Design a protein around this ligand. Structure first.
Ligand code: QVG
Ligand code: QVG
Ligand code: CL
Lengths: 298, 302
């Protein structure tokens, strides 16, 4: 029993964190095989022109108390790839994956190439992440683990004025309409990840919380009309299919749970809580719920 | 900016998780140097659990009865001893991944990271707090016994908890790494219930200071309170008494934000009285009590 916001074990990623120093800027880099990946803003804009002025010895890479030697450098979108002479002996089995809004991942927050904390979060529908980052956290990475494979999905680049965070996949493509430059940028109006709220309602049922259940069911169209009103993301047939296992396990059809969600949106919780929360939690995917309520290991 | 429930990076602890089997029971063990630590109830059957005599059950066991598996490598047990409710299995190989570590016993209200494991394999990491009733509100399934709670301040792992059991209310009970239970619990299937839980007041105040540091001031008021009047009020909401030690501990946060500890106590009194009125504090509609004053300073400053 119990339901916690749980991150993946960060060990496979910790063995990849290095410090990258260029001029006065110091941030984090991800050392996989003989390449160190980091935000291209470490050289700070015309990034091609700024980069052409740099030599390999301008980039100081530090892996623990060992200085790595940079033997090449290239840019791929908003990520700088520093070729080093030494392949990381701790390189795990990995992939670079681009995630969709609503998908969750673990963030290993780092400062000076040293991991300080791990937390779970979701890529918001507005492509920002509600992270916890201070100055020096750029280059920190987001990831998932699938069996023994680390899927790198995020690299931290910046903080928006509202305190939310923006970054790229490991190929340097930003999530959202953001750019890596000092200019006026604002996150769009955010919405609630509906499939994730439903998955969390199933987790609550699995944990013995049933007060919000009702005898009612709804149509996918009627629920989406209600979801559009309360700034909730539309629920697709794919989402309904994805919630199938949880629906079969609890005996509560997705549209049966949707009618619970609809009543919760129009009436509130009425002093009650669900899994110790007075708000509807949307940062657990259906897969996160099954993984935690079944104990999958890595 | 931002405030998250943040766990310590679990890597130093992952390299210590092993699987311990004794008969039909399989749980997790913590491999540090040449010793594997695990709950002593690994020697029991589900039948023995009502009134086990661990000394009697342990004397009947030999080293080869304990199967220890570190990854795909079977470790050889060369000795065994019991220390309170923990079984210490001496093995023939020192863990090459042994970090710098300490065994620390924590007090209620203290937080720590939990590396949940099944079959000696880590499955997740989350942040926890020792509740005032000495239970932890964890997320644990069958086979999670032996999973550990820890803090990683500096490069040293302070082991503070080993999971032993789930109470009927779904909350969890365990021991420090010396095998001493937190709370009035015993490693027996007898009727045991957690005492009425209360809110960790000093932690809620620390979290209100984290909100101020992050630009949330809506809950502040022009009032102050005596420490005694605050405690008379807070007790009525099932909040732990706030001691002079707690007031002193909140000093740095008070100095940083310019809000006296007793002024923040008056905002808390008002929040208890009024609720949030549709508002949130740091993305939460409830008063969060699983961030210590030390956690707030670490996350907001470094
Ligand atoms: O975003 C940045 N810094 C920080 C990131 N995450 C949390 C931070 C929290 C506080 C803080 F002061 C800096 C934090 C840097 C430095 C400020 O300006 C820019 C502008 C940019 F276009 C880019 Cl791509 C990066 C930055
Ligand atoms: O607590 C136990 N198991 C589990 C622990 N943590 C979450 C669990 C969640 C579910 C579950 F079925 C077992 C879980 C075991 C087996 C049941 O009985 C006892 C009795 C005891 F005296 C002791 Cl010390 C341990 C246990
Ligand atoms: Cl303590």
């Amino acid at each position: 029993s119990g339901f916690r916001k749980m991150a993946f074990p960060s060990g496979k990623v910790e063995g990849c964190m290095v410090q990258v120093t260029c001029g006065t800027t110091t941030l984090n880099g991800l050392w996989l095989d003989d390449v160190v990946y980091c935000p291209r803003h470490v050289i700070c804009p015309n990034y091609e022109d700024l980069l052409i002025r740099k030599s390999n010895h301008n980039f100081l890479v530090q892996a623990g108390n060992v200085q790595l030697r940079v033997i090449g450098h290239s840019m791929q979108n908003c990520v700088l790839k520093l070729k080093v002479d030494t392949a990381n002996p701790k390189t795990p089995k990995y992939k670079f994956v681009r995630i969709q809004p609503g998908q969750t991942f673990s963030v290993l927050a780092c400062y000076n190439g040293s991991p300080s904390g791990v937390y779970q979060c979701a890529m918001r529908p507005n492509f920002t992440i509600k992270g916890s980052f201070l100055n020096g956290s750029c280059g920190s990475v987001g990831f998932n683990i699938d069996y023994d494979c680390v899927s790198f999905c995020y690299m931290h680049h910046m903080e928006l004025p509202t305190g939310v965070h923006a970054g790229t996949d490991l190929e340097g493509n930003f999530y959202g309409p953001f750019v890596d430059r000092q200019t006026a940028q604002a996150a769009g109006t955010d919405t609630t990840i509906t499939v994730n709220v439903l998955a969390w309602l199933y987790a609550a049922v699995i944990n013995g919380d049933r007060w919000f259940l009702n005898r009612f069911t709804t149509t996918l169209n009627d629920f989406n009309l209600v979801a559009m009103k309360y700034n909730y993301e539309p629920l697709t047939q794919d989402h309904v299919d994805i919630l199938g296992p949880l629906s079969a396990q609890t005996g509560i059809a997705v549209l049966d749970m949707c009618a619970s969600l609809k009543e919760l949106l129009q009436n509130g919780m009425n002093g009650r809580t669900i899994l110790g929360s007075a708000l509807l939690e949307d940062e657990f995917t259906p897969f996160d719920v099954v993984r935690q309520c079944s104990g999958v290991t890595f």
